[PDB]
UniProtKB/Swiss-Prot annotation:
Associated disease: Leukemia, chronic myeloid: A clonal myeloproliferative disorder of a pluripotent stem cell with a specific cytogenetic abnormality, the Philadelphia chromosome (Ph), involving myeloid, erythroid, megakaryocytic, B-lymphoid, and sometimes T-lymphoid cells, but not marrow fibroblasts.
Protein name in the entry: Tyrosine-protein kinase ABL1
Residues recorded with modification Phosphotyrosine: Y7, Y52
Gene: ABL1
Subunit text: Interacts with SORBS1 following insulin stimulation. Found in a trimolecular complex containing CDK5 and CABLES1. Interacts with CABLES1 and PSTPIP1. Interacts with ZDHHC16, ITGB1 and HCK. Interacts with STX17; probably phosphorylates STX17. Interacts with INPPL1/SHIP2. Interacts with ABI1, ABI2, BCR, CRK, FGR, FYN, HCK, LYN, PSMA7 RAD9A, RAD51, RAD52, TP73 and WASF3.
Tissue spec: Widely expressed.
Membership in a protein family: Belongs to the protein kinase superfamily. Tyr protein kinase family. ABL subfamily.
Bilayer-crossing regions: none
UniProt PTM comment: Phosphorylation at Tyr-7 by members of the SRC family of kinases disrupts SH3 domain-based autoinhibitory interactions and intermolecular associations, such as that with ABI1, and also enhances kinase activity.
Whole-protein coverage range: 64 to 121 of 1130
Organism from which the protein derives: Homo sapiens
Location of this chain's protein in the cell: Cytoplasm, Cytoskeleton; Nucleus; Mitochondrion
Record function comment: Non-receptor tyrosine-protein kinase that plays a role in many key processes linked to cell growth and survival such as cytoskeleton remodeling in response to extracellular stimuli, cell motility and adhesion, receptor endocytosis, autophagy, DNA damage response and apoptosis. Coordinates actin remodeling through tyrosine phosphorylation of proteins controlling cytoskeleton dynamics like WASF3 (involved in branch formation); ANXA1 (involved in membrane anchoring); DBN1, DBNL, CTTN, RAPH1 and ENAH (involved in signaling); or MAPT and PXN (microtubule-binding proteins).
């Protein structure tokens, strides 16, 4: 379930989470249309755009 951010994303509307390009994250799930992903990082938990992340083996 390990992923990496494709781009920086600045938290905006409710319950989103800032992530930084190249940072790893874990994915808990997705929103109703799959366009938002609920992720966990060392900074917290929140929604990030699903097209801003990709899997990484380790």
């Amino acid at each position: 379930n390990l992923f990496v951010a494709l781009y920086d994303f600045v938290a905006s509307g409710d319950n989103t989470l800032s992530i930084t390009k190249g940072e790893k994250l874990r994915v808990l799930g997705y929103n109703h249309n799959g366009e938002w992903c609920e992720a966990q990082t060392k900074n917290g938990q929140g929604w990030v755009p699903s097209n801003y992340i990709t899997p990484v083996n380790s």
